[PDB]
Amino acid sequence: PIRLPNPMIGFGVPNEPGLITHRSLPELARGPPFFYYENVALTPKGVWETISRHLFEIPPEFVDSKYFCVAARKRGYIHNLPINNRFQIQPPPKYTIHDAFPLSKRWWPEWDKRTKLNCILTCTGSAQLTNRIRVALEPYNEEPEPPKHVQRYVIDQCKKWNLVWVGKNKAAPLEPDEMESILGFPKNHTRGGGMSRTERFKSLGNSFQVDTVAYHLSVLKPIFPHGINVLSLFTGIGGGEVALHRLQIKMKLVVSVEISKVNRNILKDFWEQTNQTGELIEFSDIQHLTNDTIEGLMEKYGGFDLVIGGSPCNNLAGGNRVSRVGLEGDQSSLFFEYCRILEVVRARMR
DNA sequence: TAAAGGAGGAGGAGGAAT
DNA sequence: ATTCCTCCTCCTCCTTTA
Numbered sequence: 274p275i276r277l278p279n280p281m282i283g284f285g286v287p288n289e290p291g292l293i294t295h296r297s298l299p300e301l302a303r304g305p306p307f308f309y310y311e312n313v314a315l316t317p318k319g320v321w322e323t324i325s326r327h328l329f330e331i332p333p334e335f336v337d338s339k340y341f342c343v344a345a346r347k348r349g350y351i352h353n354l355p356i357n358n359r360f361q362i363q364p365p366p367k368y369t370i371h372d373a374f375p376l377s378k379r380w381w382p383e384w385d386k387r388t389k390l391n392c393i394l395t396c397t398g399s400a401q402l403t404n405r406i407r408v409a410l411e412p413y414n415e416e417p418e419p420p421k422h423v424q425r426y427v428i429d430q431c432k433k434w435n436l437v438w439v440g441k442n443k444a445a446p447l448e449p450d451e452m453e454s455i456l457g458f459p460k461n462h463t464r465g466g467g468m469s470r471t472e473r474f475k476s477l478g479n480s481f482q483v484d485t486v487a488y489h490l491s492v493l494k495p496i497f498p499h500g501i502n503v504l505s506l507f508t509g510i511g512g513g514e515v516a517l518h519r520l521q522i523k524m525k526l527v528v529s530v531e532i533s534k535v536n537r538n539i540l541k542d543f544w545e546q547t548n549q550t551g552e553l554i555e556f557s558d559i560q561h562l563t564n565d566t567i568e569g570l571m572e573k574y575g576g577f578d579l580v581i582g583g584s585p586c587n588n589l590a591g592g593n594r595v596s597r598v599g600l601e602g603d604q605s606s607l608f609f610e611y612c613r614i615l616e617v618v619r620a621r622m623r
Numbered sequence: 624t625a626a627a628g629g630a631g632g633a634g635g636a637g638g639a640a641t
Numbered sequence: 642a643t644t645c646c647t648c649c650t651c652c653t654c655c656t657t658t659a
């Protein structure tokens with residue numbers, strides 16, 4: 274009957290009380306290897322109960338990423354890592370809208386009481402939706418405040434699509450370079466490959482919060498001085514890889530699995546534009562990743578130190594008005610593939 | 624054609640009252 | 642144990658536009 278923690282500090286978050294330095298982790302879940310699983314907090318009833326059950330009955334750590342970046346992101350994490358001696362990433366992130374968007378405060382209305390953004394999703398606001406707002410705020414420009422019925426209109430639209438003020442009565446949606454900056458990714462991390470503006474948003478919505486993830490993975494730097502061998506499933510745009518990079522942890526081996534070709538080239542770009550010492554191997558479909566080739570890469574590079582990944586949440590997310598069936602869905606059922614692969618690596622690390 | 628736009632809620636959290 | 646109220650969701654799918 275597990276419920277959501279209030280507040281979502283998990284086992285603790287930087288600059289916030291309620292920190293815990295130890296937990297009673299069951300014997301069966303003891304590594305090696307270390308695994309790290311991420312997914313949406315707000316799921317249909319009985320989802321996290323099933324997920325945790327297959328992951329050795331480990332109680333999930335729910336963390337809202339609002340304690341790291343300016344945008345909210347209520348996520349649940351399951352892992353077998355130590356909690357003690359965690360540290361955060363540098364530089365410190367912009368917590369409030371006032372800090373993240375300095376150039377917006379010249380245009381920001383006094384009647385907009387927001388200091389935090391909502392969740393960065395795959396869909397963004399339209400460039401004609403911002404026109405419908407400007408023509409509705411233009412007549413009342415002479416007076417300090419517009420009518421309440423108009424005021425209710427713009428506010429509801431802003432909170433829905435996460436709009437920011439960039440000009441006189443101009444509320445435009447976020448730009449990809451700003452989304453990357455909020456999530457922790459470097460600017461133009463997803464720009465290359467002739468990627469369309471729409472596809473950049475879809476690959477950014479489905480992504481980690483680097484500042485949050487790296488905070489958890491920070492307990493791996495002193496214990497692995499020589500580096501690590503990572504096996505990332507559903508790697509996307511390399512949320513876990515960017516986290517380790519800024520954590521100053523050497524990455525000997527990275528075996529990534531990604532069905533999307535454009536997402537694969539992003540990681541390859543980040544690998545070459547960083548001049549990484551280690552080696553990158555890229556797989557496509559996770560349903561074709563046989564355990565023969567798994568144990569093949571195992572005996573050559575010497576096992577896997579970390580198995581990080583975040584299963585698809587298309588059937589779990591509340592935004593889905595068509596096919597929100599839970600782990601019974603088409604995309605979200607691939608979580609068991611994570612379990613299968615994770616079961617194979619454990620078999621040899623024993 | 625490839626890209627942007629628009630139409631379209633259920634479902635719980637988290638309240639602050641009894 | 643109650644209400645009643647406000648808010649937020651790693652979104653799918655059809656249509657329009659350049």
Ligand SMILES: Nc1ncnc2c1ncn2[C@@H]1O[C@H](CSCC[C@H](N)C(=O)O)[C@@H](O)[C@H]1O
Binds near residue numbers: 479481533586
């Ligand atoms: N059958 C499959 N095999 C491998 N990857 C898949 C897959 N189905 C979907 N995916 C990938 O899973 C991703 C969503 S989950 C990825 C989360 C996030 N991008 C991260 O950094 O971890 C999508 O980018 C998609 O390309």
